[PDB]
Amino acid sequence: NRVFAEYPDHIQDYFKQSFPKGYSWERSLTFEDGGICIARNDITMEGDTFYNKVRFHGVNFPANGPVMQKKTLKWEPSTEKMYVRDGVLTGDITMALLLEGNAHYRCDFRTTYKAKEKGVKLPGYHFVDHCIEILSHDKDYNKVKLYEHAVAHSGLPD
Amino acid sequence: NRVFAEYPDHIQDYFKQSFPKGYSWERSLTFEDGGICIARNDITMEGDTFYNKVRFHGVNFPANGPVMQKKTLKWEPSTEKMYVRDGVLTGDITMALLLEGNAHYRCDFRTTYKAKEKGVKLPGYHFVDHCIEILSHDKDYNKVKLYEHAVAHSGLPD
Amino acid sequence: NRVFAEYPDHIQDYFKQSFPKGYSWERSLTFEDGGICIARNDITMEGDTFYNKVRFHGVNFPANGPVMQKKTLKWEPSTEKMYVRDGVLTGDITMALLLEGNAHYRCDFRTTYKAKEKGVKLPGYHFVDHCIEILSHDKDYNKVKLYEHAVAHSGLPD
Amino acid sequence: NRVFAEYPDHIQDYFKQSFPKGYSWERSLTFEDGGICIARNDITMEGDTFYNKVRFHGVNFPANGPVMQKKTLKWEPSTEKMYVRDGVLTGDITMALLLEGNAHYRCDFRTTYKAKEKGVKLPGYHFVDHCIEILSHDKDYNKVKLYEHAVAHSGLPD
Amino acid sequence: GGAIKPDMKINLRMEGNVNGHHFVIDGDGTGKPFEGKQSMDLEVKEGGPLPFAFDILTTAF
Amino acid sequence: GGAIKPDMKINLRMEGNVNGHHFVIDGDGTGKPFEGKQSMDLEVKEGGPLPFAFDILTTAF
Amino acid sequence: GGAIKPDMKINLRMEGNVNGHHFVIDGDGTGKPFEGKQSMDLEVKEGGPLPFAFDILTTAF
Amino acid sequence: GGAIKPDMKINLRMEGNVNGHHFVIDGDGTGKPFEGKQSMDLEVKEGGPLPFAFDILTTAF
């Protein structure tokens, strides 16, 4: 939920401006070995609570790849490139999973963000640094504590 | 369902050999303008009938792209390339949708095929020519009559 | 040189119709492990001889990948999809190099074909089956005898 | 030349450590409309001067695309993700060109960097923010003044 | 053949979501596996009329 | 601000399928929108133990 | 066809660089354009023995 | 640093071909490696004026 990102006053905050009605995002995760995932989240709000309805689908992961073999360790921090494509706010990212052995597993992200209410002003080209981490989890990952810190900016030199 | 494909005697027919137990397939449809779909079908059999449980999800299609604007005419005939990746039968295809205006819209297909039961020999590299057509349909496509013809072969010189 | 492809009467032969003036083609070879090559060939004709000025550039192949470790055995036969893109005849192919261990290494081809002469009649969507092979070669491939057989067609059902 | 990048003390500066011997890099530029470029640069040093031997080749750019029609305004600032792939320092970037009309044209960058002298320590996963701009240029761009500012960092939170 | 007959019937149900639009589609058809041909009658059960090109779904039936 | 409070609760439910494996995961957390931070406790209600890297799912919560 | 003969000769010169390795290859061959067949004898002139798979180059001759 | 000086000069020559168009560009500039800043004056020696966007070449200098 990009609402959880520190936006500076000089950059239009499409996400915070999307509530109370809310917004929804769709994303394609294209991994370098052919594995591909699609996801979507419809985000609404009421009172002091955000409600998320999420769907996630993945296919074509190699039987002996790091995903099916559970050899990932974490996503490296990243910088999402935010811009408008054919009238729709889009975020492209060069993501990478750290693997056991210290090699990286690349994944290309493309997320499209759409406000429910019409007229929400679109922002100009900007950036959003990210850092997502699994703080803790039980043996088989049946229970996981997740955390994310995100900050928007205008890149160099500003 | 690749079961519906004429397979020559010199080419192992993975699909017809997958029954009566059946098989499932997963597919990623990567359209050239960023739209991405993921699909899957669990195929079983009872009597002389194939039962298909299908799921189809898509994201990031441009608002003004040929898909959301319903500008497609048909899929062009194609030639699927069958081969094994990490012990799994895979089919990659250079697909194209003909558009009104005499132009085409490209889509890259990757399908992974998996027999439900053991004992099914993986085929060697081969090809499957395809031709899918909507024979008829009503105004809103609420009712559609579909058709497909497929033939496996060994390419040239064979 | 697509001139060497058997074209049926019902399909416009852009290549044979490009001489005696000649034509040139540009191509991008995108391999599945990041390796990327681009090539171009300026083809001319003097009498009963075709002249070819070819340039081939490749980068980012993994130090231990099948290319730099010379572990390929041959290109599998293929089916090229020909169609017009922004007024230029284009060919897209799902290519694959057979490796040792009976495994394959994928590469996506996109070739653009341009007659030196303007206005040469462009063909409609069609296919060209290919089969290229090294008939013989010395120890380190300093001397190689090459061969290709190609045939154009309209796909199924035709 | 990534030698021109402000590296913090906590991050291994592979480039400055590659001199006086020098280093070279290869890059693939994959534009979203099919245009593909491959470039390389051999960098050496003698005295207080860096010498660059550069080659740049491109193919398949659409006739009416922003590149062949000269409708680009500039590259947006960017953040390069630096990591090691098969023992070779690699940089992947989500690049974008702003076009006349306020729209953007995407290009994916992958650069492999190799020191001439073996033994140069590879850095850990990190980032390099960039901002390249044409300060001035004559009408036909036969003369162009170029400028770049680059800063390496560890991303969030540090 | 044995397991598969020269003439086979086809039962199908598809459920999905494209760009946020949900839909359900049922299918009833027949095919000749050894001849590599099949035909099917599809009917959108939910989500009709679809706001996107029906062509993207066809190979998934 | 206004509509969004400096402190927000987070309710979530994810349903999915990876390489054929179905699963449902519930989430409950909180965050500080203007600080760009959030944390959540996730629990696999169906499909556990997941036969694939949990990491591929994290940015979707 | 006329313009193009049933039997044609083929001369070629390729120059390139892969992963930093420069090379020059000469080619001499013949072919039958209307039969879609051709053959060529290749001779590496510079850069041999190539430190990479010769196969990646074949469709460019 | 020692090896690299706070202020460096840059010399360059680029040769290439884009969509069939050949060109050669000479470069002369200066920069501060430790400040991550550089500048350069480019001059097309051959192939000018370029028939394509000069921007595609900039990061290669």
TrEMBL record, chains A, B, C, D:
One of its GO terms (biological process) is generation of precursor metabolites and energy. The keyword Disulfide bond does not apply. The chain holds residues 65 to 222 of 226 of the full protein. The keyword Secreted does not apply. It comes from the Eukaryota. Coiled coil: none annotated. Belongs to the GFP family. The modification Cysteine sulfenic acid (-SOH) is found at residue 107. Keywords: Chromophore, Luminescence, Photoprotein. This is Green to red photoconvertible GFP-like protein EosFP.
